[PDB]
């Protein structure tokens, strides 16, 4: 839901 991109 937040910025989950690694």
């Amino acid at each position: 839901a937040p910025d989950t991109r690694p």
Partner: single-chain antibody, 224 residues
């Protein structure tokens, strides 16, 4: 080294305006959301604003305290994020940081602005080298879950922030292996397995609630 370099702060009058800038290097800026977070002694850390990608039409969300007054924006061709602050008040005084990435790995050096719901952590803990110490972070809304995406961030002298852990238990790149994230007893936790002298610092947790962040009040860790 990723670098986030901020500018624009100073000594301003109530009712005034001001614009902050942050320029990114060392990572692909355009692929990540960015946030502004501020620190005051009237207890920051306080998350202020976020801006998503060119694919989300640059959507933005603001803390209730700054909405209608602050504007966050980004220029991906200059790898820069900005914060236009209008109708400033005494409450906006503090050190302002741009930060992002999984979800708060990278922090700018901060820029001072002087104008002239509850996340709880341990006030202080005391350990010594070689010991295993655990810091916790509880929410007043009940049990922290992986849907809160807990982050842990470290503050060292003076006002130098480094992200340690995001997404409950994902270590940011280049963070020492002694640092670990968990969920224990309906709280978020950070464990340092073998504390070192240099881990003396202030540790902050942040929890996500649907469309915004709430930061804990911070834990002062002393290492004798």
């Amino acid at each position: 080294q990723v670098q986030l370099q901020e500018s624009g702060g100073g000594l301003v009058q109530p009712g005034g305006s001001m614009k902050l800038s942050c320029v990114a290097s060392g990572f692909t800026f355009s692929n990540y959301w960015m946030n502004w977070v501020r620190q005051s002694p009237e207890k920051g850390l306080e998350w202020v604003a976020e801006i998503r990608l060119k694919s989300n039409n640059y959507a933005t969300h603001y803390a209730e305290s700054v909405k209608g007054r602050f504007t966050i924006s980004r220029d991906d061709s200059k790898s820069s994020v900005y914060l236009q602050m209008n109708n400033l008040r005494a409450e906006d005084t503090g050190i302002y940081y741009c930060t992002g990435v999984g979800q708060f790995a990278y922090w700018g050096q901060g820029t001072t602005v002087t104008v002239s719901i509850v996340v709880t952590q341990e006030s202080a803990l005391t350990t010594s080298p070689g010991e295993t110490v655990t810091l916790t972070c509880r929410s007043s809304t009940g049990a922290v879950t992986t849907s809160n995406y807990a982050n842990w961030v470290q503050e060292k002298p003076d006002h130098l922030f480094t992200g340690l852990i995001g997404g409950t238990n994902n270590r940011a790149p280049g963070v020492p292996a002694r640092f670990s994230g968990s969920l224990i007893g309906d709280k978020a936790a950070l464990t340092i397995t073998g504390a070192q002298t240099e881990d003396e610092a202030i540790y902050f947790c942040a929890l996500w609630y649907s469309n915004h962040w709430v930061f804990g009040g911070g834990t002062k860790l002393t290492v004798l």
